[PDB]
Structures are given as structure tokens and as C-alpha cells.
Structure 1
Amino acid sequence: GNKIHPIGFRLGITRDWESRWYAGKKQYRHLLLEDQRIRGLLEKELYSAGLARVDIERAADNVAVTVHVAKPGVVIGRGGERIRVLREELAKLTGKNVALNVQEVQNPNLSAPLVAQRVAEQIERRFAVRRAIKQAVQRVMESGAKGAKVIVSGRIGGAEQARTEWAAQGRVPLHTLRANIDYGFALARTTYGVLGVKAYIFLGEVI
């Protein structure tokens, strides 16, 4: 089951990074140090409602604090105060150049990490594996997709033994360069252990 990361199989041109700036030798590591610590901080105290892209472009202390969220509404708060102090903690730890970017990718059934998160949410909310997953897949195909494959891996719903689970629909061609496929990895979890949700969204040929 050596499914190399779709993103890893997208690096050539077929997918962009979540970071793109320069580093000159001895300084690279320090960047990625802070960079990642921010990233994760953003991830945690913000994830609340859909967000894949951990994107940030930079250079001379400037920071293109960038992010593709989902719902922006109540997540901006009651006037821009949720963003306020969060960006204040970013500006805190990264005492350099915060310039927030809070986006939105219209469709939930877009961007595999998102529906991935939804699927883990199904089981994290103690729900029928095969059912909820298959129907999320059909949601993918419904909204307007070219592929829908999301599988859940772990102590499936109960009873000791623990494998993955089938939820495939449509076409999922991923040996092809131009196929532009999004890949997400929802971190599913139960009281009695760990579950693994992997999401695959095929988007289109030669774009």
C-alpha cells in the first residue's frame, strides 16, 4: 500500500507549497523553526471551521501571513476581534511583520483536507463509518467532482481488530501528472484509540 503522497506526487508543477520565500544557508533552519511554530499555532487555535492552506511567503523580515480558511463569518468574530488578538500572538512570537490573510474556498466538497476533516468529524462524533463516509463521498460527486476517495484507517467503530475502510466513487486517477488532485489527512480519533482518514479529490485534466 505504498500510496506516495498525492502532494508529493504533485510537487513538479501540479501543486504549490505552503511556504515560498528565500533563505541563505545558515538562516534557513531558523525560518522553518519559527515558520512551523507559527503554522502549528495557527493550525491549533484557529482550525475551528475549515482551513487547509498553511501558506506563507516572506523575505526581509516581512511576513505574508497567508491562509485559506473556510467559513469567515463568525470566525472573524463580532467585528474583527477574533483576528485581532490572534494576529497579536502571531505578532508576539513572530515579532517581525504580520500581515494576515483570511480566505475562503467556496465549496466544502472542494479541497480534500476539508471533506477529510468533515469525515473525521463524523466518527469523532461517534457515527457510522461506512455510511457517513460513503455519503460524504456522494457529496463530493454531487457538488461537482471528478473523483471521490476517502478512507478511514484504525480501530473501525469497535472490536479490537483494526484495518482501513472502503469508500471510493467516480474515477480516481493519480499516476497522472496533470490531474491536479487535492489530498487531505484527517486525524480521526476514539476513546479506545486512533483512526486515520485520507481524502482524495480529483479536480481536472490539463488545466
Structure 2
Amino acid sequence: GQKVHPIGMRVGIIRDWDAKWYAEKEYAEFLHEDLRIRKFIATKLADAAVSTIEIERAANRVNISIHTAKPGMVIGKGGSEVENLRKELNKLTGKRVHINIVEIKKPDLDAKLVGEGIARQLENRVAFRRAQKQAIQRAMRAGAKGIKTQVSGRLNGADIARSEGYSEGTVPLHTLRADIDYAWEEADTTYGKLGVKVWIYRGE
């Protein structure tokens, strides 16, 4: 293995972090509290399945916001689930949290959601070649410049591991005026454990 998480290459240059803090003498407390913050959307991710959470911070307030493609289950029926999530998050926090919902557009051109969906087809015993090809076509139908895909492990419920994936379009990986995305996700039907990786490119 030799390659790099590409979002860890472009950060600081053409994007930022997801924590816009500046904190001395209470830094690791908020770090291992934000670690607890990220875990709590496991209740979301089974249904709501958000992508990113941006957490800014005022003096004595908590001011967070999310990005997702499914605005249905996150807004509740009348916002009543929203205040319940604020209460359950504040029970772990004790501090004034003020959550927000931002909807993404052209939602098929994500990174985490497409890999999560193809891992979902892997968790229903659907064949890997046809699912990757229909996935990269329906991502190409969204309008892009390229998608790379790769899956590994004990493929298709078999013996000793292979690793193979397919690609189409262009993808300048080694260049810095890129604005690409990336996502890794596990997979298991019942045998061992697998993994999917997924790439896009849309110019700077």
C-alpha cells in the first residue's frame, strides 16, 4: 500500500476542515466531545444517512449544521423529531446546541452515499460487477467527468481474496486543481468483510 487519502492532500488549499474552532486550554475535551457528537448520528444513518456535519462554535454556544440528500426523516413530521434530537444531544452535551439542516443538490454526485448504497446492495447478495457498472452509469447520467470504483476482499461469497474494480471518464488524481471526492465503506453479507471505494471528478 502506498496511496494517500486525497482529501488530506487538498485540505487547507481548496477546502477547509469540519471544525472551525480556535481553542486553548479546553481543546482535547471538545475533541473527545466532538468524537461523541459524530457517533450519535448512527441513529440518523440507518435512515437519514447524512454526508457531512459542519460544526462552528461561538463563545458559549454550540452551532452545528448538516448536509444530506434525504430531508424527509430528519425534519420529522412537524419538526418534533428535530427538537427531540436537540434534547438527546444536549443530554450528552449540557450546552446550547442549535442544529440546522441544509439540503444538497444533484444528490447522486456524492462520495459517501454512493459507496453506502453499493455496500447496501452487497449486503443483500446482489452481484458486484453489474452493481458497480449500473452505479457508475447512473453517476455518469448525473453529469460528471469521471468515476473510479474498486472492491476487495472475499468477493461474491468465495474463497481467498481478489480485488477488482472498474472506471470510466477521466480522473486527474495527481493534480491539485482537482476538487475531487473520496469515500471508503466496509461491507459484509455474512462472509468475512469487504470494502468499497469511490471517486468523482468535476474540475476545480
With normalisation by structure 1, the TM-score equals: 0.91
Contact 1:68 1:102 in 2 (8 A): yes
Contact 2:48 2:73 in 1 (8 A): no
| 1:158 corresponding residue in structure 2 | 157
| 1:113 corresponding residue in structure 2 | 112
Please give the secondary structure, in 1, of the residue aligned with 2:200: strand
What code does the residue aligned with 2:37 have? I
| 1:174 corresponding residue in structure 2 | 173
* Cα distance, 1:153–1:101 mapped onto 2, change above 3 Å: farther
Identity of matched residues, %: 54
Runs of 4+ aligned residues of structure 1 deviating over 4 Å after TM superposition are none
Point out where structure 2 has 5 or more consecutive residues left out of the alignment. none
Please give the secondary structure, in 2, of the residue aligned with 1:145: coil
How far 1:105 moved relative to its partner?
1.4
How far 1:120 moved relative to its partner?
0.9
Contact 2:50 2:66 in 1 (8 A): yes
User: CA separation in 2, counterparts of 1:84 and 1:150?
Assistant: 39
How far 1:106 moved relative to its partner?
1.9
RMSD: 1.5
Aligned length: 203
How far 1:66 moved relative to its partner?
1.3
* Cα distance, 1:57–1:51 mapped onto 2, change above 3 Å: same
What code does the residue aligned with 1:97 have? R
What code does the residue aligned with 2:23 have? A
How far 1:50 moved relative to its partner?
3.1
Would you say 1:200 and 2:193 are equivalent positions?
Answer: no
How far 1:182 moved relative to its partner?
1.1
User: CA separation in 2, counterparts of 1:85 and 1:128?
Assistant: 40
Point out where structure 1 has 5 or more consecutive residues left out of the alignment. none
What code does the residue aligned with 1:125 have? N
How far 1:61 moved relative to its partner?
2.8
Select the structure that is richer in strand.
2
Write the deviation string for residues 75-94 of structure 1: whole angstroms up to 9, x where unpaired.
32211122221121111111
With normalisation by structure 2, the TM-score equals: 0.92
| 1:16 corresponding residue in structure 2 | 16
Write the deviation string for residues 105-157 of structure 1: whole angstroms up to 9, x where unpaired.
12232221121111111111221111101110111111111121122222211
Contact 1:119 1:186 in 2 (8 A): no
